[PDB]
Amino acid sequence: SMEQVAMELRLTELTRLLRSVLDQLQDKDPARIFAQPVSLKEVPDYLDHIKHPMDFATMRKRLEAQGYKNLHEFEEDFDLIIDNCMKYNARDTVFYRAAVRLRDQGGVVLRQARREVDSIG
């Protein structure tokens, strides 16, 4: 159907905008603390602590399979990255502090992304 295609064009455009958001968010992590999944070889107990792990490479695979239907779903995943980190790591660690800074800096980017998704439809 022509409607299915139009729907697919919007998803593709959302995917384009989310890719740009993702790039901008990831620049706020120049240490690459959140680039890749936590290693279960190096943190064998991790899944006893964190039930839904997340990281920027895993978000990127979802993104490129057009697996985010809306900004809300994308934000859920970004928030997992931050929230998981702030639970597993103590307040006085480079990891926790890096999550706080990513959260604070990402807020600005996400605030405008929401306006652009609403605005462009």
Swiss-Prot record:
For the cross-link Glycyl lysine isopeptide (Lys-Gly) (interchain with G-Cter in SUMO2), list the residue numbers: K41
> What superkingdom does the record give?
Eukaryota
Compartment list: Nucleus; Chromosome
Tissue specificity statement from the Swiss-Prot or TrEMBL entry? Highly expressed in testis.
Domain named Bromo: which ranges?
A: 9-113
Q: What does this protein do?
A: Scaffold subunit of various histone acetyltransferase (HAT) complexes, such as the MOZ/MORF and HBO1 complexes, that acts as a regulator of hematopoiesis. Plays a key role in HBO1 complex by directing KAT7/HBO1 specificity towards histone H3 'Lys-14' acetylation (H3K14ac), thereby promoting erythroid differentiation.
Subunit: Component of some HBO1 complex composed of KAT7/HBO1, MEAF6, ING4 and BRD1/BRPF2. Component of the MOZ/MORF complex composed at least of ING5, KAT6A, KAT6B, MEAF6 and one of BRPF1, BRD1/BRPF2 and BRPF3. Interacts (via PHD-type zinc finger domain) with unmodified histone H3. Interacts (via PWWP domain) with dimethylated and trimethylated 'Lys-79' on histone H3.
| The protein, known as | Bromodomain-containing protein 1
The protein's organism comes out as Homo sapiens
Write the span of the intact protein that is present.
Answer: 555 to 674 of 1058
